[PDB]
């Protein structure tokens, strides 16, 4: 399990770069997605390009123990009740010189395969790519906005995408979702729909190394397997940049520790975000410029006939947050059931959400919520 808390540590640093560049945007990002693909591209690298990403992740894959660990994540995480869509996709030209003793080596360690496509037919390339995503994201992500940069010169491209919905151990009432005033970072107050529940929640108050006090809250999914955390400062003027720039995997593991089950009145806004990130910039911001230099890509572990390069590297995430879908006010969760006046926790400030596989600590999702 030493890969779980380590691979997720990588994806968080592939988020600090994304958030500081969105400055103030509805960002959604999967730390597991960027990690599950970089370790795959790790097998196809050598020289500095291998070290450029092995020093950023902090481990190797060809070494014992850490290669079959990705299979067990991809196997255990798919726990599931039709919610997630984990898929990896590397695209390349057809009829290229592969090393003798490599294609066996890739299929064995990942329980996955390489996806053979055609770049000469730029038209049918955008279809096979998007329909490999249409069938691997449960149809919730079909059209793409990065396939336009595809030409005949483009030779290698990496993709990763996931769709996330969610049940609740104690679902919000569809009947209590009221209009409310959500405060945006710039100062605008938008009429945003918000749901509200009155149950016992896992709450903890943690403070920054700067003197900034947080409301941290946990909401459980079915089987208590997956859970999403919501973090927001006490006052408004404290930006998410303060929270975001100090994220770490152990910071989530400790937040799960200092939580007590308190009776609280939650108010949380619905949201449905979609984000396509150009990972070329954050990865070149994490010490991996040797991957994209039009003729500089030390891929001697895979490419015996040269040259070759990594053209584009993106990720699309689409996260909808509602009450389990259209399951509706099925009377297992009524609004009150206890006539006390709880303390109110209102999420009217900007906030960041974090998705974690608690039985493994794997951080599945993350992102800023600036305006629903």
């Amino acid at each position: 399990s030493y890969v779980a808390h380590l691979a997720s540590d990588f994806g968080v640093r592939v988020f600090q770069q994304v958030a500081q560049a969105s400055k103030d945007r509805n960002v959604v990002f999967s730390p597991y997605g960027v990690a599950s693909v970089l370790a795959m591209l790790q097998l196809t690298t050598g020289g500095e390009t291998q070290q450029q990403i092995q020093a950023a992740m902090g481990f190797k894959i060809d070494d014992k123990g850490m290669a079959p660990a990705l299979r067990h994540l991809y196997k255990e995480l798919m726990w599931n009740k039709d919610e997630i869509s984990t898929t990896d996709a590397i695209f390349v030209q057809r009829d290229l010189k592969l090393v003798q003793g490599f294609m066996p080596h890739f299929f064995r360690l990942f329980r996955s395969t390489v996806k053979q496509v055609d770049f000469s037919e730029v038209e049918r390339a955008r279809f096979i790519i998007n329909d490999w995503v249409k069938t691997h994201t449960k149809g919730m992500i079909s059209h793409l906005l990065g396939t336009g940069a595809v030409d005949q010169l483009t030779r290698l491209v990496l993709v990763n995408a996931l769709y996330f919905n969610g049940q609740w151990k104690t679902p919000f009432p569809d009947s209590s979702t009221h209009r409310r005033l959500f405060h945006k970072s710039d100062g605008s107050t938008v009429s945003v729909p918000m749901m509200a529940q009155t149950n016992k929640f896992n709450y903890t108050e943690f403070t920054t190394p700067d003197g900034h006090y947080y409301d941290i809250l946990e909401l459980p999914y079915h089987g208590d397997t997956l859970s999403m955390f919501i973090a927001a400062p006490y006052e408004k003027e404290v930006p998410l940049s303060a929270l975001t720039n100090i994220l770490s995997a152990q910071l989530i593991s400790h937040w799960k520790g200092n939580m007590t089950r308190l009776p609280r009145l939650l108010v949380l806004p619905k949201f449905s975000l979609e984000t396509e990130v150009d990972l070329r910039k954050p990865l070149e911001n994490l010490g991996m410029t040797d991957m994209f230099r039009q003729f500089q890509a030390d891929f001697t572990s895979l490419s015996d006939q040269e040259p070759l390069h990594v053209a584009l590297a993106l990720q699309k995430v689409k996260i909808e947050v509602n009450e389990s879908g259209t399951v509706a006010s099925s009377s297992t969760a009524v609004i009150v059931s206890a006539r006390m006046a709880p303390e109110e926790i209102i999420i009217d400030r900007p906030f960041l959400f974090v998705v974690r596989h608690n039985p493994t600590g794997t951080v599945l999702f993350m992102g800023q919520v600036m305006e629903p």
Partner: protein, 248 residues
Amino acid sequence: IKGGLFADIASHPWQAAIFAKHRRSPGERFLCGGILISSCWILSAAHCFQERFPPHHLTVILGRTYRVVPGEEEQKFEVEKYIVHKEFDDDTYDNDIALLQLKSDSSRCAQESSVVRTVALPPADLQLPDWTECELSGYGKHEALSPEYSERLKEAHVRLYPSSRCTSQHLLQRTVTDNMLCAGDTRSQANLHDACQGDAGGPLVCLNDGRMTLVGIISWGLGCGQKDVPGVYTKVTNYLDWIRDNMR
């Protein structure tokens, strides 16, 4: 309080408030309602203190009509200690009752007036007939969906559901025990009378021998104010030997 109308604290001079201080901010927040049984002792609901507030965090307010706006003959106290029932179920809300004590100099806290006086305790032999109309009071939310709480005391009247209609089956399978008590509005024309979020620890007073006597303490209910879905209360008559044995 769903249904009914606003109240004057003289109509229910036994009704009190409870305020727990913001753990982080300064100042009080509204917690639960209370019923003044002794001059220095009040009854409330147990689950109002599941988050174990220290006694110097609680402040009881007697003789006050509005929630935050103080009164002319009002009396304000600071809780010295409170007694939650030992075997209280923080999961089925059984044994939902808590005994609060007021702090004073010389063993006397409240003094009788037109807005403040104690309420009579029920006899252990009290079994009122079914569908008896009784009044309840509180500062809680109006509907189950109202955003904020009430800025003034509201009174409403409800009838006693019989023991047959007061079963776990009739309340979405939830546990209902003989320490509980059912009550709701049984009309056929909407806005039925029932307690709501913010009245826990409040009174359910009925007329016994021409005497308004405390019968039930507002506990829970799949509210607020539903048709043929009664509210659940704490059967006070079973804890007289808990009231009496304590507070010494």
